[PDB]
Design an enzyme around this catalytic site. Structure first.
Site, short mmCIF file in Angstrom:
data_model
loop_
_atom_site.label_atom_id
_atom_site.label_comp_id
_atom_site.label_asym_id
_atom_site.label_seq_id
_atom_site.Cartn_x
_atom_site.Cartn_y
_atom_site.Cartn_z
N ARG B 27 0.81 -1.26 0.00
CA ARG B 27 0.00 0.00 0.00
C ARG B 27 0.84 1.30 0.00
O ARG B 27 0.40 2.36 0.47
CB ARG B 27 -1.07 -0.03 1.13
CG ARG B 27 -2.04 -1.17 0.93
CD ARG B 27 -3.32 -1.12 1.77
NE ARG B 27 -4.23 -2.23 1.38
CZ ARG B 27 -5.41 -2.12 0.73
NH1 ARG B 27 -5.92 -0.93 0.37
NH2 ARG B 27 -6.10 -3.23 0.45
N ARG B 31 -3.59 6.11 1.01
CA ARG B 31 -4.24 7.29 1.59
C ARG B 31 -3.38 8.07 2.55
O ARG B 31 -3.66 9.22 2.82
CB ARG B 31 -5.55 6.86 2.28
CG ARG B 31 -6.57 6.30 1.31
CD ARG B 31 -7.74 5.57 1.97
NE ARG B 31 -7.35 4.21 2.29
CZ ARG B 31 -7.91 3.45 3.21
NH1 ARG B 31 -8.94 3.90 3.92
NH2 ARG B 31 -7.46 2.22 3.41
N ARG B 40 -7.01 10.95 -6.09
CA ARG B 40 -8.21 10.13 -5.94
C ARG B 40 -9.51 10.92 -5.80
O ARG B 40 -10.59 10.38 -6.05
CB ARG B 40 -8.05 9.17 -4.76
CG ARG B 40 -7.24 7.93 -5.13
CD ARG B 40 -8.02 6.85 -5.85
NE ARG B 40 -9.22 6.51 -5.09
CZ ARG B 40 -10.43 6.91 -5.40
NH1 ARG B 40 -10.64 7.65 -6.48
NH2 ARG B 40 -11.45 6.56 -4.63
N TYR B 154 -14.54 -12.71 -0.46
CA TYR B 154 -15.21 -11.49 -0.93
C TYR B 154 -16.43 -11.77 -1.74
O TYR B 154 -17.41 -11.02 -1.66
CB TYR B 154 -14.26 -10.61 -1.73
CG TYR B 154 -13.31 -9.92 -0.82
CD1 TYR B 154 -12.01 -10.39 -0.65
CD2 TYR B 154 -13.69 -8.75 -0.14
CE1 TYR B 154 -11.12 -9.76 0.18
CE2 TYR B 154 -12.79 -8.10 0.73
CZ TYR B 154 -11.52 -8.63 0.87
OH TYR B 154 -10.61 -8.04 1.70
C1 LIG Z 1 -10.08 -0.70 1.57
C2 LIG Z 1 -9.82 -1.71 0.47
C3 LIG Z 1 -9.67 -1.47 -0.87
N1 LIG Z 1 -9.43 -2.69 -1.49
C4 LIG Z 1 -9.46 -3.69 -0.53
C5 LIG Z 1 -9.68 -3.11 0.68
C6 LIG Z 1 -9.77 -3.82 2.02
C7 LIG Z 1 -11.16 -4.42 2.22
C8 LIG Z 1 -11.21 -5.27 3.47
O1 LIG Z 1 -10.68 -4.85 4.54
O2 LIG Z 1 -11.79 -6.38 3.38
C9 LIG Z 1 -9.26 -5.17 -0.76
C10 LIG Z 1 -7.81 -5.51 -1.02
N2 LIG Z 1 -7.00 -4.84 -1.92
C11 LIG Z 1 -5.75 -5.45 -1.88
C12 LIG Z 1 -5.78 -6.47 -1.02
C13 LIG Z 1 -4.61 -7.40 -0.74
C14 LIG Z 1 -3.60 -6.76 0.20
C15 LIG Z 1 -4.17 -6.65 1.60
O3 LIG Z 1 -4.45 -7.69 2.23
O4 LIG Z 1 -4.32 -5.51 2.06
C16 LIG Z 1 -7.07 -6.53 -0.47
C17 LIG Z 1 -7.51 -7.55 0.56
C18 LIG Z 1 -4.52 -5.11 -2.67
C19 LIG Z 1 -4.36 -3.67 -3.06
N3 LIG Z 1 -5.27 -2.62 -3.12
C20 LIG Z 1 -4.59 -1.51 -3.56
C21 LIG Z 1 -3.31 -1.88 -3.80
C22 LIG Z 1 -2.33 -0.91 -4.38
C23 LIG Z 1 -0.84 -1.18 -4.37
C24 LIG Z 1 -0.49 0.18 -3.86
O5 LIG Z 1 -1.40 1.05 -3.98
O6 LIG Z 1 0.61 0.42 -3.34
C25 LIG Z 1 -3.16 -3.25 -3.48
C26 LIG Z 1 -1.94 -4.15 -3.55
C27 LIG Z 1 -5.12 -0.10 -3.81
C28 LIG Z 1 -6.25 0.34 -2.89
N4 LIG Z 1 -7.46 -0.29 -2.83
C29 LIG Z 1 -8.28 0.34 -1.92
C30 LIG Z 1 -7.56 1.39 -1.42
C31 LIG Z 1 -8.01 2.38 -0.37
C32 LIG Z 1 -6.28 1.39 -2.01
C33 LIG Z 1 -5.15 2.38 -1.72
C34 LIG Z 1 -4.28 1.96 -0.51
C35 LIG Z 1 -4.82 2.41 0.86
O7 LIG Z 1 -4.84 3.64 1.18
O8 LIG Z 1 -5.26 1.54 1.65
C36 LIG Z 1 -9.70 -0.12 -1.58
#
Ligand SMILES: Cc1c2[nH]c(c1CCC(=O)O)Cc1[nH]c(c(CCC(=O)O)c1C)Cc1[nH]c(c(CCC(=O)O)c1C)Cc1[nH]c(c(C)c1CCC(=O)O)C2
Ligand SMILES: Cc1c2[nH]c(c1CCC(=O)O)Cc1[nH]c(c(CCC(=O)O)c1C)Cc1[nH]c(c(CCC(=O)O)c1C)Cc1[nH]c(c(C)c1CCC(=O)O)C2
EC number: 4.1.1.37
Lengths: 356, 356
Positions: B27, B31, B40, B154
């Site tokens: 990540r 954010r 975003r 999911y």
């Molecule tokens: C909140 C969320 C999102 N997507 C997801 C969630 C969590 C839901 C839950 O708790 O069940 C689901 C998700 N997305 C990703 C994963 C696998 C990694 C992990 O376990 O966290 C999972 C489980 C990879 C990801 N999802 C994202 C990346 C981007 C790689 C990177 O941005 O560096 C990856 C590997 C991008 C993403 N995707 C999202 C956000 C807010 C972001 C930006 C990062 C942050 O601020 O948290 C939305």
């Protein structure tokens, strides 16, 4: 109190040979029982907890269905934070909530002196005594409380966190205030747990339900010392009061990394979640603690025939000595009572077959 | 594509000696960066994911702040279920949601044939290519996807579960339908992952984020075979296409119980959460896989000075060989960019000191 008839659970807890493996289930008094929901429909949750008769009734309910080898009092871990002065509400279909969590070090000021907490929890003592009398020696009665770290997470978090990021922020950013809170919790828990035993509890379980959010390093700094202190101090106070110390169980959910440490923390029994292979746990803890657990609670969604085969495998892995069967966590509210029945019968049937 | 300038991350991934320990953060485009929030604010989340330029920009952002040794594409694991035909909404301040989860075996009928999924995810391929071109060889680009079991959770759950009780109910009550779903997911993932590499990804990470809700027995039945198949099949297809296979990373969060199995699953790298002691993980996996991780992400709430000391300890435990530094999970949205900076600088400073 009436003389104990079936003491298999206590004998296994202390590490003695038994004729069969004793079994009980975390949340055995719970929503999966239609009779539980019925009884619970009459008061709100914390009002139920404050009624000795309601608590006794809910405790007895599972025993009327299943030949469980122990009863556990109906109460909640969150009565301690509440007795410390925090408001806790039961949110409809959403669980416990602290509308006003401790947000900063200054918030520690609104907590009661921990020494007065046992007297605030007199209602729990009344429930334990009443239940011990009504059980009439059938099986031992387990009392319980939350471990300091786990209770801290409820006190500091604004609810439903998969990370405990705020609670962990406290540990890293406010280590001194965290130790202060953890000490307050320890000092409330010791007289409370002693009181449970004075009132009739025959064993104690400490729930470190949130252990897994910590790694080894934080766990050893902030969770383990207080876990150790709780056991040392309770045992000491019971001795001094002229009472027999009871077997103590530590359950650190998702605490695989702490098993060796936990086996030398002053507890007769280490409870395990379902992710730890029984054989690996046995290597971690060695030969002088009893292990409790650890069937995946979701395994009870399988057929009665499948539950029996899974139980058989589990008992093969643990072996007959130094073992109390339980699930790896509490029963879920959508589970079928007949399958809980099947789990109980299977531990009894196979543990005998594994001996004779 | 431009020739790679810093390949330290790839060299460590394959298990080669390097002059320092390469580091990146899960990540790292997130954010916690004010510039991320700004970018975003212009599209909704899945629209951002469908814009190659937006994705490239978010990927680059952390690299402009920190000398990270790898970039990871901006995308999400949930694009796969969506490309399979499920509607997924980003719920304001609450995260991803599937308003209509698969509820029974019959619901499998509304999924696309998995073979057509790669062509639905062309936008991700465009983002990868654009990002590989713009990075201009600075550091390698990591592509990624969710592991079958995790994606299944999911697809089947109605959101925010600490137990995955419904998903696990599927495994116990509907094992055949579960295997069918897990196969569909595997067959979508393989061509998708191959496509990422065709488009320019230089390494792949598979996220088994929900591994911990399973014990060993269920994990080996329902998660591990598909994890194994993903690696076998991707490698095979890349070979056949005349392309070089990329290092593959398996990350099973809360997967302590599976480490031995995972070290023989066809992955160059095993990523670890923070609850696993580095030395114990090294015993589990042996000497022919690279380990990635594993600092408690909450440790970044500590002072920059403390982060440095924690990093030093971590690097001492892992030792210099077969190691890529990362956190034990993703960065949290309230974390300070300067502390992420401190984590990066500390891995670089101490890993050199540990060599020379
Ligand atoms: C909140 C969320 C999102 N997507 C997801 C969630 C969590 C839901 C839950 O708790 O069940 C689901 C998700 N997305 C990703 C994963 C696998 C990694 C992990 O376990 O966290 C999972 C489980 C990879 C990801 N999802 C994202 C990346 C981007 C790689 C990177 O941005 O560096 C990856 C590997 C991008 C993403 N995707 C999202 C956000 C807010 C972001 C930006 C990062 C942050 O601020 O948290 C939305
Ligand atoms: C939903 C809930 C309650 N209380 C709590 C929750 C979970 C909140 C969360 O997820 O963060 C908090 C709690 N209560 C208890 C624990 C420790 C055990 C554990 O980790 O589950 C914890 C973490 C012990 C308990 N809490 C309770 C017992 C009773 C012992 C027994 O009833 O058999 C114990 C040991 C009683 C209780 N307490 C409550 C219910 C619904 C029940 C009945 C059981 C059920 O249907 O789930 C409310």
């Amino acid at each position: 109190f009436p003389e104990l008839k079936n003491d298999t659970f206590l004998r296994a807890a202390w590490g003695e040979e038994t004729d069969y493996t004793p079994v009980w289930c975390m949340r055995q008094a719970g929503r999966y029982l239609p009779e539980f929901r019925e009884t619970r429909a009459a008061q709100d949750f914390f009002s139920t907890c404050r009624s000795p008769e309601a608590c006794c009734e809910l405790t007895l309910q599972p025993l009327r269905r299943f030949p469980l080898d122990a009863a556990i009092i109906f109460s909640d871990i969150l009565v301690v934070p509440q007795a410390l002065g925090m408001e806790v509400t039961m949110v409809p279909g959403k669980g416990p909530s602290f509308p006003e969590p401790l947000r900063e070090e200054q918030d520690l000021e609104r907590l009661r002196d921990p020494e007065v907490v046992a007297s605030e929890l007199g209602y729990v003592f009344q429930a334990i005594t009443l239940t011990r009398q009504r059980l009439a020696g059938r099986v031992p009665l387990i009392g319980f409380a939350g471990a300091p770290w786990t209770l801290m997470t409820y006190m500091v978090e604004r609810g439903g966190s998969s990370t405990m990021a705020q609670a962990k922020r406290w540990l890293y950013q406010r280590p001194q205030a965290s130790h202060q809170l953890l000490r307050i919790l320890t000092d409330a828990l010791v007289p409370y747990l002693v009181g449970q035993v004075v009132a009739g509890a025959q064993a104690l379980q400490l729930f470190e339900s949130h252990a897994g959010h910590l790694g080894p390093q934080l766990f050893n700094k902030f969770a383990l010392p207080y876990i150790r202190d709780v056991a040392k101090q309770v045992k000491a106070r019971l001795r001094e009061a002229g009472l027999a110390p009871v077997p103590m169980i530590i359950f650190a959910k998702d605490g695989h990394f702490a098993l060796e440490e936990l086996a030398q923390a002053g507890y007769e029994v280490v409870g395990l979640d379902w992710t730890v292979a029984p054989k690996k746990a046995r290597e971690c803890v060695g030969k002088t603690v009893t292990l409790q657990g650890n069937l995946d609670p979701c395994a009870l969604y399988a057929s009665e025939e499948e539950i029996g085969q899974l139980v058989k495998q589990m008992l093969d892995d643990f072996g007959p000595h130094r073992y109390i069967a339980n699930l790896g966590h509490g029963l879920y509210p959508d589970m079928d009572p007949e399958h809980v029945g099947a789990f109980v019968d299977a531990v009894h049937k196979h543990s005998r077959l594994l001996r004779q």
